[PDB]
Design brief:
- The structure is a homodimer.
- Chain A is of the alpha/beta class.
- Chain A has nine helices and ten strands.
- The interface of A and B includes residues 124 and 138 of A.
- Strand 5 (about 105) of chain A pairs antiparallel with strand 5 of chain B, so a sheet runs across the interface.
């Protein structure tokens, strides 16, 4: 078994090393929490880590892995060490795909909708990677941000559909003071674009309050705010049930927006209570 | 937690009940062994159970589940009780597919070859089911017969590719006295067909000895025996490496045959050492 130093950051890149250390730790009664990331960490990620750390005695494992592009489609560790993360898992593509793209996960039809429209193989990559990380780490709980809501829903589907014995924990989106959802993509915005980008959260929050007057009022309010914003080009604005099926006549839903500011595509979403 | 009576047969049909009992047993140090089946048990299956039972203290879980047909495509429990099996898992289709065919496993290209030629979605069903059973039961070891060799190879691929922490144990084919590989399909043969069916094992065993004289001699020997047999129609006869890639010039391989006797399709395969 590889060395593990309790209460310090331990970095591993071989799947077998993490698997072995995780198994040893779990046997002592320490629950293992997994926070999957693609690196370029910001406060939104630190919130996932802090949610994991609230579980007493937990060993928090943060993975950093950028999934390769499918056909036709740095102070990270220092930040983790400062949060008291004990395990960072940083595998290479070759370690994750030693046999190339061979067995993979085929998501349900939700993967072809919304973010899957522009990128029809994206969620197959995501669910394949997440499934592997879950089997390597065998966490008790795995933490995902609500900012990528469709991703979170699809992970819940993966866990239900393959009978995975892990709790999926969705953590609320961390926002800038003006409401902008944090994302590594925000780094690409110039100051004028960054100012205009507040329109996504403004539109969604306006919709969530407009929703006392019903679903059409909510959608129209959000659209009006987006239409008021300079150089925000809307890709989609959809109201769905909380599992991303069709919106119910009356009840709980989720409103999702995707919009482009110059070359940068941003997403946001919010809980909606229709007629409440 | 559901009742479990040690040293007796316990039958469960809910995935959650097996998951809970298996987890409780594993915590006591009893290793859990899984033997997946489609019921209609014969001695070939009992061999898998006996291999599982050889692991000291093991709780043997035998699943019986017939995977539904995809588009365009009884004394079992008494036998298990007599073998000292403590858990039989007999889920309904609805319990296994409560959300229909949603997330599934997409096998690698080997699934389109050999048995996947006639049935291109068969192994996706097999690997989806096996993945689920592995996550429900969380066994230390899972046992499969070598008779369905391509299935065994594909399961090894599933386990490697998704980083599953389970040992896959292939058990040699159990044969009738004349060499015929046991299979529930043998029940469909009339006496004349049953007698002619010895040709598959005869052809493969002849090939395994002919192989001292090389790969062509082995294939030609097997073909000659099949061609001598009345009302045996050969679907394929292929020599491959042990992972079912291309045969090596000199070395270890596997010879696989599929043939029809009237309406019944039978399979067999054997280890080949080329030039040995």
């Amino acid at each position: 078994i590889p060395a593990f130093h309790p209460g310090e950051l331990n970095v591993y890149s071989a799947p077998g090393d993490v698997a072995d250390v995780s198994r040893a730790l779990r046997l002592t009664g320490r629950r293992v929490m997994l926070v999957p990331t693609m690196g370029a960490l910001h406060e939104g990620h630190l919130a996932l880590v802090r949610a994991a750390k609230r579980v007493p005695g937990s060993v928090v494992v943060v993975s950093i892995f950028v999934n390769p592009m499918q056909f036709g489609a740095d102070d990270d560790l220092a930040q983790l060490r400062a949060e008291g993360v004990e395990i960072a898992f940083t595998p290479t593509t070759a370690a994750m795909y030693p046999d190339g793209l061979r067995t993979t996960v085929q998501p349900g039809p939700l993967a072809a909708e919304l973010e899957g429209g522009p990128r029809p193989t994206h969620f197959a990559g995501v669910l394949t990677v997440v499934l592997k990380l879950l089997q390597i780490v065998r966490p008790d709980r795995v933490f995902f941000g609500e900012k990528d809501y469709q991703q979170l829903v699809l992970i819940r589907q993966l866990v239900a559909d393959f009978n995975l014995d892990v709790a999926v924990v969705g953590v609320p989106t961390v926002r800038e003071a003006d409401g902008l959802a944090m994302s590594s993509r925000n780094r690409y915005l110039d100051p004028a674009q960054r100012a205009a980008a507040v329109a996504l959260s403004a539109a969604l929050t306006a919709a969530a309050h407009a929703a006392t007057a019903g679903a059409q009022a909510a959608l129209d309010a959000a659209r009006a705010v987006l239409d008021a914003a300079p150089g925000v080009a809307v890709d989609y604005l959809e109201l769905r049930d909380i599992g991303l099926g069709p919106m119910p006549l009356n009840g709980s839903g989720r409103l999702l927006v995707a919009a482009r500011l110059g070359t940068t595509r941003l997403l946001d979403n919010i809980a909606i209570e229709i007629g409440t």
